[PDB]
Amino acid sequence: MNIFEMLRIDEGLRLKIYKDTEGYYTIGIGHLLTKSPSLNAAKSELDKAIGRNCNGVITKDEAEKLFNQDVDAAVRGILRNAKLKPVYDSLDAVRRCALINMVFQMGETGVAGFTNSLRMLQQGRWDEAAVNLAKSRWYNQTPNRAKRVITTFRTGTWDAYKNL
């Protein structure tokens, strides 16, 4: 299992604009297009992002290309971030994927706000951190996915996804 497979499980693949659980316009593998209500604003962002007139629809290849970009950008964002970098550096390879997953979903800034959990992860206090991470809107709003990520941080294995 790797970061791409992990996120492909959590986000799914959709080739037509769709709304995410928060109600935002998304396409492909969890690629947020805009927080704006306008489907039109969404279609424009899409064409801008693909470099073609997509008319709200894209090919598998295009979705995978966006995915590669988003993952790369998530990783680089963590590495550039003063709060995130030290945590990342302190984790094993599986747990690193779990932090990338959170960043992909909620952005650098949002994850950077998990001050207390970050601190626990850095100190390698797995169980404590799992319990703190669950006390979030994040967990309450998308509990199945959050549980998967949380279990990854707790155990350091891919058990949560080995099911899936």
Choose, from 5, 10, 11, 72, the residue flagged as catalytic.
11
- Resolution of the coordinates, Å: 1.7
Method: X-ray
11 is catalytic: yes
Choose, from 5, 10, 20, 108, the residue flagged as catalytic.
20
Q: How many domains does the chain have?
A: 1
Domain that holds residue 67: 1-164
Binding-site residues sit at: 32, 104, 117, 132
Return all residues near 95 (Cβ < 8 A) that are at least 6 apart: 121, 152, 153, 156
Burial class of 10 by CB neighbour count within 10 A (0 to 12, 13 to 18, 19+)? buried
**Cα dihedral 122, 123, 124, 130 sign:** negative
The amino acid at residue 147 is K
92 is catalytic: no
Binding-site residues for substrate sit at: 32, 104, 117, 132
Return all residues near 159 (Cβ < 8 A) that are at least 6 apart: 151
Residue 135 belongs to domain with CATH number: 1.10.530.40
Tokens 């390698």, residue located: 124
Burial class of 28 by CB neighbour count within 10 A (0 to 12, 13 to 18, 19+)? buried
